[PDB]
Structure formats: structure tokens, C-alpha cells
Amino acid sequence: LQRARTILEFEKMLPEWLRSRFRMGELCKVADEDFRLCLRINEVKWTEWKTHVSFLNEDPGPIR
Amino acid sequence: RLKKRIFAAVSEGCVEELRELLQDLQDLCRRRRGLDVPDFLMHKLTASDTGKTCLMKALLNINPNTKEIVRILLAFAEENDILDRFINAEYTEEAYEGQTALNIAIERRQGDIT
């Protein structure tokens, strides 16, 4: 919590054209006409086994 | 306009739409000059960019009626006698090279289609 207050006070200082270059996230077509600028986290799970539906992408590998 | 409809009816679960398109594949190859009919019918089911066939597309998209869709596709490949090349197809891209339809059916935990 003490380091997080140091990170944010650096961010109000640097100008507007620097905040576009160091911006987090990527635009993702969630549904028909819906783009939300999400953030990706990976996960490995060995306990709950199930068949997979409700995925956005059929091909699993990183595309570019 | 034929190949894009077969991949769409398979992914969504349309049974009667899929069966109507398969009779048109027999009727389109019947008027063909007829040199490489087993070679011609394969590239009407295989995506030339990735190598994915229509049997792979059914198993990636599990439907409440996906057990009857697989039975329709196997009876089509049995009549025209390309059943060996249809059930043993592989990807050609480097990211998925070697993946067949049986790797897909085991990963979706399907004990019956296997």
C-alpha cells in the first residue's frame, strides 16, 4: 500500500502524451459492437475438471 | 458460398441445414468432369489457410445435438470413399501441427464420441 501511493503520484506528473504510450490493456471484441479494453491473466487449475464452453476464441495459442 | 455455410451450420447445431448442403455437394461433383473427385471433395471441406476440416469444427463446438452431427458426416465420407483421409487429417500451421480430431475429442472429455 505504501508503494502503490508512490506509483500513482508519479502518474499524475508525467504529461498526456506519455500516458498514451504506457497505457495498459488491449481492445477485445467481446460481443456484437462491444469493445472494453481488457487485461489478460493466465491460470493453471488441476482440480475442477469440465468440458469447455463460453470461450471467445476456438484456437488456444497466442495469435501475434 | 457453399463452404462458408457448411462451417456455419456445424458450429451452431443446425441439423436439417447441414443435411441439405451435403446433397448439393454430391450434385456439384456429379456435373464435374471427374478427374480427381476424391481430391476435389477434400478441399471443399478443408480450410486452405489452416488445414481445419469440418469434423474438427464440430468437436470444438459442443452442442446438445453434436452426437448426431458426427454420425451424418461419417456416413457421407463412407459413401464417396474418402473416409480414411477425412478422419485422419491434420493441421498445417506451425502452432498446431499434428493435431487430429481424436486429440480434440479426448480434450473435451467425450467418452462416447471417442
Swiss-Prot record, chain A:
Residues 1-64 are cytoplasmic. Signal peptide: none annotated. It is found in: Cell membrane; Cytoplasm; Lysosome. Expressed in keratinocytes and hair follicles. It comes from the Eukaryota. Belongs to the transient receptor (TC 1.A.4) family. TrpV subfamily. TRPV3 sub-subfamily. Non-selective calcium permeant cation channel. It is activated by innocuous (warm) temperatures and shows an increased response at noxious temperatures greater than 39 degrees Celsius. Activation exhibits an outward rectification. The channel pore can dilate to provide permeability to larger cations. May associate with TRPV1 and may modulate its activity. Is a negative regulator of hair growth and cycling: TRPV3-coupled signaling suppresses keratinocyte proliferation in hair follicles and induces apoptosis and premature hair follicle regression (catagen). Homotetramer. May convert from a homotetramer to a homopentamer to allow pore dilation. Interacts with TRPV1; may form a heteromeric channel with TRPV1. Interacts with SNX11; this interaction promotes TRPV3 trafficking from the cell membrane to lysosome for degradation. This is Transient receptor potential cation channel subfamily V member 3. It comes from Mus musculus (Mouse). The gene is Trpv3. The chain holds residues 694 to 757 of 791 of the full protein.
